[PDB]
């Protein structure tokens, strides 16, 4: 009876010495970023929409155009909603499928349904085109070094449909991409032919990003059993911060904070974590003042802070990976 599963408690990263984090910080770039990935996603893309449709194309044909041998997979499925049964689709890219371990980035791609009010449609830019954009920026960034995958731990993204509640927020309407995947990938046996091992313990840590894009955002160290990594990230942070390579940075305004938050914030990675994976749930607290406002446009973006946590996670992820 492998222990494979347990393999994610002690598993320690392979840090970055000063000229390879310099390297990161140049490979990425928050101009390209933000005119090939971010502005396409800046519709009006609730489920079922046009735009949803037309994201989705974007998000498949940006992973599509790399060299890493990424599997691209579309679950759709059915669910009761306030407006009736409808159709919804998450977005799931892969390395190495059949890697026993994968460390899991996402965010959802949908935006919020609002009919549009004074002429304005609401765009979700920092909810969340641009943690969209991010993953997909990194998938860039990193194609040479993680085409090298093609320790049985590999790397996935996902894009979950339907994160908001069609009305306002209630248990049954919100998450229906995350509550159907968590549930897919906890029936699903994983590796292929396994006994009594699902998807979701292979899920190492599941990184959930979510309405980035704002000033001055502090994220806090929400679960002790992922406050080893948060601690990572704030190291990162300031190792990067203090060889000059974050932008209109201090440490008094760093990102990752000394603080927990003990209460519970509804996003997609509740499906998961109550069904026991590790989650480093990258939301900051408290949301942008834009929440939820025709305000969370392009204009109200802070390119700076994007690009700074751009070099921060993709640090983190060859640490994670041993790239
Ligand atoms: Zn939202």
Redesign the pocket.
């Given at each position: 009876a492998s222990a494979w599963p347990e393999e994610k408690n002690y598993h320690q990263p392979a840090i970055l010495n000063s000229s390879a984090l310099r390297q990161i910080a140049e490979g990425t770039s928050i101009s390209e970023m933000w005119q090939n990935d971010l502005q396409p996603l800046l519709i009006e893309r609730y489920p079922g929409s046009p735009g949803s449709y037309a994201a989705r194309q974007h998000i498949m044909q940006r992973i599509q155009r790399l060299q890493a041998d990424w599997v691209l997979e579309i679950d759709t499925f059915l669910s009761q909603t306030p407006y009736g049964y409808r159709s919804f689709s998450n977005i799931i890219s892969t390395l190495n499928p059949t890697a026993k371990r994968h460390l899991v980035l996402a965010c959802h791609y949908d935006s919020?349904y609002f009919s549009h009010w004074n002429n304005r449609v609401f765009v979700?830019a920092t909810?969340?085109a641009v943690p969209c954009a991010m993953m997909l920026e990194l998938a860039r960034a990193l194609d040479k070094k993680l085409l090298s995958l093609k320790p049985d731990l590999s790397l996935q993204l996902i894009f979950f449909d339907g994160?908001?509640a069609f009305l306002h927020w209630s248990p049954q309407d919100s998450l229906y991409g995350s509550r159907h995947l968590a549930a897919k990938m906890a029936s699903t046996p994983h590796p292929p032919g396994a006994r009594g091992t699902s998807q979701l313990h292979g899920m190492d840590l599941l990184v959930l990003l979510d309405?980035i894009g704002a000033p001055n955002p502090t994220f806090p160290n929400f679960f002790p059993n992922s406050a080893r990594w948060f601690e990572r990230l704030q190291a990162i942070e300031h190792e990067l911060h203090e060889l000059g390579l974050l932008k209109d940075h201090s440490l008094e305004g760093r990102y990752f904070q000394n603080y927990s938050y003990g209460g519970v914030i509804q996003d997609d990675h509740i499906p998961f974590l109550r069904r026991g994976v590790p989650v480093l749930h990258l939301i900051p607290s408290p949301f942008p003042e834009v929440?939820?406002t025709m305000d969370d446009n392009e204009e109200n973006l802070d390119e700076s802070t994007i690009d700074n946590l751009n070099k921060i996670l993709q640090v983190f992820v060859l640490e994670y990976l041993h790239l």
């Open positions: 919020k979700g909810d969340s994160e908001e309405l929440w939820h």
